[PDB]
Write a protein that binds this ligand. Structure first.
Ligand SMILES: CCCCCCCCCCCCCCCCCC(=O)OC[C@H](CO[C@@H]1O[C@H](CO[C@H]2O[C@H](CO)[C@H](O)[C@H](O)[C@H]2O)[C@H](O)[C@H](O)[C@H]1O)OC(=O)CCCCCCCCCCCCCCCCC
Ligand code: CLA
Ligand code: CLA
Ligand code: CLA
Ligand code: CLA
Ligand code: CLA
Ligand SMILES: CCCCCCCCCCCCCCCCCC(=O)OC[C@H](CO[C@@H]1O[C@H](CO)[C@H](O)[C@H](O)[C@H]1O)OC(=O)CCCCCCCCCCCCCCCCC
Ligand SMILES: CC1=C(/C=C/C(C)=C/C=C/C(C)=C/C=C/C=C(C)/C=C/C=C(C)/C=C/C2=C(C)CCCC2(C)C)C(C)(C)CCC1
Ligand SMILES: CC1=C(/C=C/C(C)=C/C=C/C(C)=C/C=C/C=C(C)/C=C/C=C(C)/C=C/C2=C(C)CCCC2(C)C)C(C)(C)CCC1
Ligand SMILES: CC1=C(/C=C/C(C)=C/C=C/C(C)=C/C=C/C=C(C)/C=C/C=C(C)/C=C/C2=C(C)CCCC2(C)C)C(C)(C)CCC1
Ligand SMILES: CCCCCCCCCCCCO[C@@H]1O[C@H](CO)[C@@H](O[C@H]2O[C@H](CO)[C@@H](O)[C@H](O)[C@H]2O)[C@H](O)[C@H]1O
Ligand code: OEX
Ligand SMILES: [Ca+2]
Ligand SMILES: [Cl-]
Ligand SMILES: [Cl-]
Ligand SMILES: [Fe+2]
Lengths: 334, 34, 341, 37, 450, 35, 32, 78, 60
């Protein structure tokens, strides 16, 4: 009945079109700030000296970039890991030249997505649901944290963070392959298993449900109209799906329990993305993928190349050309 | 009184026999010195 | 009782491993593909085709073994065992990469057999054949990547090799020579595969966390009967949760499960279209506007131009070893490289 | 290296750190002995 | 105590949840696990000793436990060279023997002793909902934890000291005589920004500050333990918190995740509590060592390292940080906040000093920079050291890399565990952890969103 | 006269970890070890 | 070396021990 | 639920199965071991032994160049 | 010095016999009367063996 109590009831209200919640009271300002600065920067930001060698990179549409090539450029290598808000620049133009929009957008984004995870738990609690949708959402959160926060921290610079753009993302991946051999890292391999399997199982489950729908419609209408939102009854026959799938492979390779099946569907890609996030997070500390260069020698001691050696040649090609003006010393130590 | 030899038996052996053969061969290779 | 009907009876028996008419082409073909791959990765070299060790016997590990593609010199020859190259000599057939077309062609016919098995079992059980239709994505990828890409290229040599690191080489080769990440068709494929993973994770999690209290135990898995008529989770609660979290939510379960098939399958088809383009070197390699500008304006740099430079480096440093038949002699002084590094 | 009076049990020392992994596996072995009840 | 699904509702893969309200068996599980921890400490230490080459540097031999002992000042002398292996061996053996005592006690309590301690004792019997007793347990443990911190203090002050990499005349074990008691410095450390140039508590750079911190920590922990034994949770905390065993587990999981991330950063960045003579260079140190190594070479070849502009226009060997400090050039410009005992002699008030860089270099500094640069914490998963494109002949992965990567992963998965148990504790307290009741589904009584 | 299935599972698991550990030993010895 | 033999012998002893304890406890109707 | 065949758990827990497989699985394992250790596999698949990648007359890769006559090239490569 | 290795070997073998015996004794409720004093004997003998090894290390 107090005004604070009234505000609390409104914030935690389950009748708002968009749930706010306490986590939302943080999510909304941070994500809105990040979105505004990101759109403005992507459209209009001046070039950014990412590599700190006074060689500004054009990232914005108005400076000659298309949607594919445009990006918000990570902050200058001269900044390193230093905190660089607007009020630490002698002018907004100095802030822009050194890639301040990247720091603002990433920090607000990171806070916003952690709050989004908390908000998912919060609404599940208010709806009397089970609480673990946020656990599944923690996989993409972990991956985003790896590329925007953990990798820069381990490498020592926000200039090494993933650029906020499409071609910027490819640059990040290529450089990452050149310096870490992520393809030959087992955690990336589990991430690929996670995403290939997640798509495989999405296709499998979708196709098996769609194949086993109960006849409810006529041939002139979409079969989707055979389901009514809120209906008691199941819209497909899991028994028929299991008969088909257990004959496609063998009876014991097929689920007869929807709860067990939906758990597997949730767990597989989530676990795979946790592994890949941890892989990126550990190569942040330069614990790289497998090195098998010159592993096979003949009796005289001559190197017999393998596919890993050819991959290494590709990596060396990427490495010698990257940041072509940024290195003064022979070893790329970060 | 189940049958001994069926289609499942052959499906199991067609894979299991060469698999154990190959596993032994790959075990032998672990001791090849250059 | 005619012999055809008696055969169709035995082939369609309910046994541990269903066979069916499709099995006559799925099982021998899949077994040839799998056994050829295991055989090649265990025993067979790529010394005469690639100048590489590619089997466990030579010392490679699971990550580095491969059934490597045949030598460039054979072009697109099907390299039959009895063909004019091997001439029935099994050892020579192994040494010239004959196992690569063996695995690829038996695998293609095995994939045809698996799709026919999907259709056959769907018809026997009485369901719609959407699992078979979903599998067209994987076949589109196999055909475009392992057959049409090398068929458009100079030879089977440039087809991906059947191996972990062989596939990684193929991936990096497509980056450095084709700028395949810039290709919109690949981008649609990435969106499809990542969205498929997302849909899998979010459906699984949503269903598990909107479950109805159907049992007394903490182990909620025991609270489901396969024959029960009632939905095991609340679609209304799920819908409200996602409507208030994400702004929108599924409200039709049939559309939800169709979407879970549509997204990854469509992504595989689109990526396959892009690969077909790459078979002819029809690549989204460059943005000519930005190349013209950087040519005229030396202050102008984007992430796109940087990736172009990365590709030139990869090509120059990888070509001599990756294409040993071309006798690429690139002296050290012509190799592109930035400062110091 | 271990002190000279202990260089005898050196092969035993090399196989000691792994044992907790065997504890984790032994949990599963006991569950399988009780039938995963 | 039920040991099956029909009697507990928990499957075999959730079997340890069957111990939630079995305080005796739970205590047994805990003591046997502690036994596992102490067993690993002792056995892994003995493994490291048996595999230790005394003359070869510790970070070249895959050691992570002997560096911890050596930082405490046992078995090592100046510059971290090993004086005697016996203290490492003694530490290992004492942990290994105690492990058996804890294993016995655990197997006893887990298997033979009372399953519930409530009946037996009022002192050891606890109910999760009994806030006074749970705070008693918090207090007894806070007093032992503070006692352990004071044990570190006593070792550093009265029992031979600890390794001070910053000691004058070279790194060595030092007895700390003036630990920093000034609460402004000590707690100021807590208030420093966790960004470059400040580093929050990771930037603690002298043993006097570390030791003064542990006197404060011991004092605050002992005081908090006494407070928790003599008090009960207040109303606001009784209202904002979930009071259950799973809830307390989730709280400790959140704390553990935080500490794991902190430890990862600590080992990656700090070279005071983690001396480079045991742990190898930090990656910041290796980069700065590269810049320094080629500063010395080129200067000795006659280059003007001050006035030599690089191809970009910035100084090749020396430049200015964005705040003007004279720093090493090249990509290492990012690590210009790095402080190291071999570098700091060449730094003036304005940063790197030209007079010092031209006249006061020492061969030990050049040797140290060469060693640190060639031991950059870069390596492959199969321990092929150096950059990932290098060939297979260098067997090295930095201990800093191993420790940082391991504790980041453990911190993350423990954050996930916190979320798992915190959400489950909340749902179970509220009564819908087992699913939605069909009759009273809340959404069926809520208005449509539109 | 039936061997308990958990014993069969334990024996097969021991043998499988053994073959895997022999394969990992070979990574550091003989061919393909870089030495 | 006889060392690879001693290491594998100790490891085999340790590997058998735990399963042996479970086997004895199951054969003798212990509190498994 | 059962398609007619004996359950695997009933098969592998039986005395006769293991009486047979205590010999069959080891015999296959040793057959593969011998296939490798006698040098038979090198001859069968034409995989070079560790001292046959390079010969006295050839220090470079034996990359195939003929379209058809590969018995001859592989012989000259030795 | 060989007496030291004898004592240490005895410690390692008694340790194995106790690793076998402790969980069986604590999980065999019907044999508990016979196995409690044996448990006490094993614990005391193990501690004495540890002390003997300790001292001998300090005598050799
Ligand atoms: C709860 C509150 C949460 C939100 C509150 C505020 C958000 C903070 C989040 C961390 C932000 C860090 C960003 C920059 C990190 C950085 O610049 O660096 C890391 C800093 C350390 O700072 C470094 O500290 C160093 C200190 O070393 C100095 O002192 C040393 C003394 O030996 C040496 O001499 C050394 O050479 C010398 O330079 C230097 O100053 C560096 O320049 C400085 O960057 O971390 C630190 O300060 C503290 C350690 C923070 C750990 C964060 C990493 C993991 C985050 C969680 C991951 C979640 C993933 C889950 C996904 C789901
Ligand atoms: C740190 C690891 C750890 C620890 C300490 C425990 C401890 C415990 N578990 Mg858990 N558990 C674990 C891991 C662990 N578990 C894992 C990984 C799983 C998944 C497989 C389970 C699954 C599980 C289930 C399903 C159940 C338990 C139960 C229990 C409790 C009763 C144990 C019992 O009666 O077993 C009896 C087992 C035996 C008698 C077999 C022998 C065990 C002994 C301890 C072997 C010790 C050998 C050792 C080398 C001897 C050294 C002696 C000397 C040197 C000191 C006990 C407190 C039960 C419970 O909750 O009770 C209510 C229960 O139902 N656990
Ligand atoms: C904090 C933990 C930690 C850390 C940092 C290290 C670090 C190190 N150890 Mg040690 N070790 C540990 C724990 C640790 N160890 C434990 C618990 C054991 C008992 C088995 C050992 C036993 C041991 C031996 C016997 C040896 C080492 C060695 C080494 C060195 C080389 C490591 C190597 O090549 O790994 C290879 C890397 C791997 C095998 C990768 C492991 C991947 C893990 C399993 C992924 C799991 C992640 C995640 C939690 C999964 C959860 C899934 C789920 C939650 C979703 C290195 C210094 C070697 C050395 O040099 O000694 C001098 C050596 O010979 N260690
Ligand atoms: C966290 C550890 C812990 C805890 C809380 C308990 C608690 C308990 N045990 Mg258990 N126990 C433990 C560890 C633990 N034990 C270990 C490791 C062993 C193996 C030696 C045992 C062996 C054991 C047996 C055999 C029995 C108990 C019994 C008991 C109960 C009465 C204890 C008693 O006599 O009163 C208080 C006892 C004292 C005040 C004197 C003992 C205090 C210790 C020995 C000295 C200080 C500990 C240590 C050396 C110093 C710090 C430790 C270091 C790691 C920092 C009580 C529930 C008895 C029981 O179940 O009764 C029904 C019983 O029969 N325990
Ligand atoms: C492991 C140690 C431990 C544990 C588990 C507890 C547990 C508890 N303490 Mg105790 N306490 C401890 C140590 C500990 N204390 C010590 C060492 C002292 C001495 C200083 C005290 C002094 C103390 C007092 C004086 C009081 C408690 C109280 C409480 C209760 C509620 C506290 C609360 O809501 O915290 C959560 C904290 C808050 C709600 C405060 C909000 C702080 C905001 C969110 C900022 C948080 C910082 C940020 C999120 C983290 C940054 C990371 C970095 C700083 C590490 C709870 C039972 C209260 C109680 O009921 O007394 C009986 C109380 O009044 N404690
Ligand atoms: C000290 C920390 C701690 C403690 C005491 C517990 C305790 C508990 N948890 Mg939690 N949990 C934790 C941390 C912790 N957890 C963390 C960090 C995570 C995140 C990964 C989780 C995630 C989690 C889930 C998802 C669930 C629990 C559950 C439970 C309960 C039953 C657990 C059980 O029987 O496991 C049995 C043990 C096993 C089945 C063995 C797990 C084997 C894993 C995969 C191996 C991990 C890798 C390991 C390092 C080996 C790598 C080497 C490899 C090469 C072989 C119990 C109360 C359950 C629950 O809610 O019950 C109420 C449950 O469903 N926990
Ligand atoms: C529970 C199942 C049972 C587990 C127990 C057995 C399983 C596998 C163990 C066999 C491993 C062989 C041991 C090495 C032989 C001794 C030679 C030696 O000293 O080292 C030989 C070499 C060289 O090392 C040096 O060799 C010298 C000459 O022989 C001397 O022996 C030196 O002392 C030695 O250090 O080192 C290695 O290769 C060590 C790395 C590999 C050893 C362990 C491999 C991993 C073990 C299993 C893990 C993978 C399995 C996955 C399963 C999934 C579930 C976890
Ligand atoms: C080619 C050819 C052919 C054919 C042949 C064949 C058909 C073969 C087969 C073969 C086979 C069919 C083989 C197999 C094998 C297999 C293997 C090689 C195995 C392996 C395994 C492993 C190694 C695994 C492991 C593991 C894991 C990972 C998991 C779990 C655990 C374990 C340990 C189990 C012909 C004559 C027509 C002609 C000529 C050519
Ligand atoms: C030793 C040392 C030192 C020291 C340190 C110190 C002094 C410490 C302290 C520390 C501290 C001082 C700690 C703290 C912490 C904190 C925290 C961690 C908190 C948390 C909280 C919470 C968790 C809350 C929650 C909540 C909220 C948010 C609101 C409402 C609801 C709830 C209640 C749930 C130095 C650095 C000098 C040096 C080195 C060494
Ligand atoms: C320090 C020391 C010691 C101690 C030791 C110990 C403490 C022991 C332990 C022991 C142990 C702790 C062992 C155990 C083990 C375990 C195992 C070996 C297991 C295995 C596993 C498996 C094989 C699995 C399988 C399975 C199952 C059962 C479930 C389901 C699935 C499957 C079927 C896969 C001694 C006395 C030597 C003396 C010297 C010093
Ligand atoms: C830091 C110290 C925080 C102290 C806050 C509470 C003071 C304790 C007084 O006693 C507490 O009074 C609060 C009012 O807030 C009551 O609510 C509780 O019933 C009582 O436990
Ligand atoms: O910033 Mn972005 O990419 Ca990370 O490694 Mn060093 O730094 Mn630069 O060179 Mn390579
Ligand atoms: Ca040894
Ligand atoms: Cl670049
Ligand atoms: Cl540089
Ligand atoms: Fe579904």
């Amino acid at each position: 009945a107090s005004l604070w109590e009234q505000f609390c009831q409104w914030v935690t209200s389950t009748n708002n079109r968009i749930y706010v919640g306490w986590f939302g009271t943080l999510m909304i300002p941070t994500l809105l700030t990040a979105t505004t600065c990101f759109i403005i920067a992507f459209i209009a930001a001046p070039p950014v000296d990412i590599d700190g060698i006074r060689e500004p990179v054009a990232g914005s549409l108005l400076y000659g970039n298309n949607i594919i090539s445009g990006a918000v450029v990570p902050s200058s290598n001269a900044i390193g890991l230093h905190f660089y808000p607007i009020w630490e620049a002698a002018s907004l133009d100095e802030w822009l030249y050194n890639g301040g929009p990247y720091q603002l957008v990433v920090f607000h984004f990171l806070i916003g997505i952690f709050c989004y995870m908390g908000r998912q738990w919060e609404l599940s609690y208010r709806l009397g649901m089970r609480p673990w949708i946020c656990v599944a959402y923690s996989a993409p959160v972990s991956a985003a944290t790896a590329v925007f926060l953990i990798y820069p921290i381990g490498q020592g610079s926000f200039s090494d963070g993933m650029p906020l753009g499409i071609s910027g993302t490819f640059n990040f991946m290529i450089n990452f392959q050149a310096e870490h051999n992520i393809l030959m890292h087992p955690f990336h391999m589990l991430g690929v298993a996670g995403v290939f399997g997640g798509s495989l199982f999405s296709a499998m489950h979708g196709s098996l449900v769609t194949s086993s729908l109960v006849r409810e419609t006529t041939e002139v209408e979409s079969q989707n109209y055979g389901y009514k939102f809120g209906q008691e009854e199941e819209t497909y026959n899991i028994v028929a799906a299991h008969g088909y799938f257990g004959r496609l492979i063998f009876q014991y390779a097929s689920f007869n329990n929807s709860r067990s099946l939906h758990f597997f569907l949730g767990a597989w890609p989530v676990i795979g993305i946790w592994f890949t996030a941890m892989g990126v997070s550990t190569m942040a500390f330069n614990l790289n993928g497998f090195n098998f260069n010159q592993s096979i020698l003949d009796s005289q001691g001559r190197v017999i190349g393998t596919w890993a050696d050819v991959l290494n040649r590709a990596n060396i090609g990427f490495e010698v050309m990257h940041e072509r003006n940024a290195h003064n010393f022979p070893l790329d130590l970060a | 009184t189940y049958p001994i030899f069926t289609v499942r038996w052959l499906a199991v052996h067609t894979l299991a026999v060469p698999s154990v053969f190959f596993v032994g061969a790959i075990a032998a290779m672990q001791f090849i010195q250059r | 009782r005619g012999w055809f009907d008696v055969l169709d009876d035995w082939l369609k028996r309910d046994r541990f491993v269903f066979i069916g008419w499709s099995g006559l082409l799925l099982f021998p073909c899949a077994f040839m593909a799998l056994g050829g791959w295991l055989t090649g990765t265990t025993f067979v070299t790529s010394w005469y085709t690639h100048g590489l060790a590619s089997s466990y016997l030579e010392g490679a590990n699971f990550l580095t073994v491969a059934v490597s593609s045949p030598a460039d010199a054979f072009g697109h020859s099907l390299l039959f065992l009895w063909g004019p190259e091997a001439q029935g000599n099994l050892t020579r057939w192994f040494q010239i990469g004959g196992l690569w077309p063996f695995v690829a062609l038996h695998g293609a016919f095995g994939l045809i057999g698996f799709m026919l098995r999907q259709f056959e079992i769907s018809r026997l059980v009485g369901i719609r054949p959407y699992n078979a239709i979903a599998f067209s994505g994987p076949i589109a990828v196999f055909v475009s990547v392992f057959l049409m890409y090398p068929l458009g290229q100079s030879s089977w040599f440039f087809a991906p090799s059947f191996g972990v690191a062989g596939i990684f080489r193929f991936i990096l080769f497509l980056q450095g020579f084709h700028n395949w990440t810039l290709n919109p068709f690949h981008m649609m494929g990435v969106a499809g595969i990542l969205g498929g993973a997302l849909l899998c994770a979010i459906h699984g999690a949503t269903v598990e966390n909107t479950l109805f209290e159907d049992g007394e135990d903490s182990n909620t898995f025991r609270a489901f009967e396969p024959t029960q008529a009632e939905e095991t989770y609340s679609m209304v609660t799920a819908n409200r949760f996602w409507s208030q979290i994400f702004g929108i939510a599924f409200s039709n379960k049939r559309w939800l499960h169709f979407f879970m098939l549509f997204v990854p399958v469509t992504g595989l088809w689109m990526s396959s279209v892009g690969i077909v383009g790459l078979a002819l070197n029809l690549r989204a390699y460059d943005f000519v506007s930005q190349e013209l500008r950087a040519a005229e304006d030396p202050e102008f740099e984007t992430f796109y131009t940087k990736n172009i430079l990365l590709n030139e480096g990869m090509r120059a440093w990888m070509a001599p070893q990756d294409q040993p038949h071309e006798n690429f002699i690139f002296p050290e002084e012509v190799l592109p490289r930035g400062n110091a590094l | 290296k271990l002190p000279e009076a202990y260089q005898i049990f050196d092969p035993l020392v090399d196989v000691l750190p792994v044992i907790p992994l065997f504890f984790l596996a032994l949990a599963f072995v006991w569950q399988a002995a009780v039938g995963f009840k | 105590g039920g040991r099956d699904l029909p009697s507990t509702g928990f499957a075999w893969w959730s079997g340890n949840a069957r111990l939630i309200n079995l305080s005796g068996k739970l205590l047994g599980a805990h003591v046997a696990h502690a036994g596992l921890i102490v067993f690993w400490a002792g056995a892994m230490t003995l493994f490291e000793v048996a595999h230790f080459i005394p003359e070869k540097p510790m970070y070249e031999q895959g050691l992570i436990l002997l560096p911890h002992i050596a930082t405490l000042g046992w078995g090592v002398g100046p510059a971290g060279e090993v004086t005697d292996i016996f203290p490492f061996f003694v530490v290992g053996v004492l942990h290994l023997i105690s492990s058996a005592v804890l294993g016995l006690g655990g197997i006893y309590h887990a298997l033979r002793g009372p399953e519930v301690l409530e009946e037996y004792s009022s002192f050891f019997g606890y109910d999760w909902k009994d806030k006074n007793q749970m705070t008693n347990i918090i207090g007894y443990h806070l007093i032992l934890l503070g006692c352990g911190a004071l044990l570190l203090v006593f070792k550093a002050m009265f029992f031979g000291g600890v390794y001070d990499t910053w000691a004058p005349g070279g790194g060595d074990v030092r007895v700390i005589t003036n630990p920093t008691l000034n609460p402004a410095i000590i707690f100021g450390y807590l208030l420093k920004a966790p960004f470059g140039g400040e580093g929050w508590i990771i930037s603690v750079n002298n043993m006097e500050d570390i030791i003064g911190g542990h006197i404060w920590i011991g004092l605050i922990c002992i005081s908090g333990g006494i407070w928790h034994i003599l008090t009960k949770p207040f109303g606001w905390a009784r209202r904002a918190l979930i009071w259950s065993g799973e809830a307390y587990l989730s709280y400790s999981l959140g704390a553990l995740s935080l500490m794991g991330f902190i430890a990862s950063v600590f080992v990656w960045f700090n070279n005071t509590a983690y001396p480079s003579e045991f742990y190898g260079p930090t990656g910041m140190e290796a980069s700065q060592s590269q810049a320094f190594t080629f500063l010395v070479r080129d200067q000795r070849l006659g280059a003007n390292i001050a006035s030599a502009q690089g191809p970009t226009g910035l100084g090749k060997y020396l430049m200015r940080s964005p705040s003007g400090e004279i720093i090493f050039g090249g990509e290492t410009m990012r690590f210009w906040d790095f402080r190291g005992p071999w570098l700091e002699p060449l730094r003036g008030p304005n940063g790197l000093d030209l007079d010092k860089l031209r006249n006061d270099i020492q061969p030990w500094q050049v040797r140290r920079a060469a060693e640190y640069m060639t031991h950059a914490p870069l390596g492959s998963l199969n321990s092929v050291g150096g950059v990932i494109t290098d060939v297979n002949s260098f067997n090295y992965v930095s201990p800093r890399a191993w420790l940082a990567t391991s504790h980041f992963v453990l911190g993350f998965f423990f954050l996930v565990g916190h979320l798992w148990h915190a959400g489950r504790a909340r749902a179970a307290a509220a009564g819908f952890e087992k699913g939605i009741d069909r009759e009273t589904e809340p959404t069926l009584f809520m208005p449509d969103l539109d | 006269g039936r061997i308990p299935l958990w014993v069969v599972g334990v024996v097969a698991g021991i043998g499988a970890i053994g073959v895997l550990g022999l394969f990992f030993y070979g990574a550091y010895a003989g061919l393909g070890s870089s030495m | 070396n006889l060392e690879p033999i001693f290491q594998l012998t100790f490891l085999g002893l340790i590997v058998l021990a735990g399963p042996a304890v479970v086997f004895v406890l199951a054969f003798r109707g212990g509190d498994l | 639920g059962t398609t007619g065949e004996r359950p695997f758990s009933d098969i592998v827990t039986s005395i006769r199965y293991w009486v047979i497989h205590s010999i069959t699985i080891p015999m296959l394992f040793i057959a593969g071991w011998l296939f490798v250790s006698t040098g038979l596999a090198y001859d069968a698949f034409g995989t070079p032994r560790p001292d046959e990648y390079f010969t006295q007359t050839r220090q470079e890769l034996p990359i195939l160049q003929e379209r058809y006559d590969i018995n001859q090239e592989i012989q000259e490569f030795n | 010095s060989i007496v030291f290795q004898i004592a240490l070997a005895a410690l390692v073998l008694f340790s194995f016999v106790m690793v076998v015996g402790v969980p069986v004794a604590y999980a065999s409720p019907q044999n508990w009367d016979r196995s409690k004093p044996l448990l006490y004997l094993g614990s005391g003998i193990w501690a004495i063996l540890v002390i003997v090894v300790a001292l001998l290390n300090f005598l050799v």
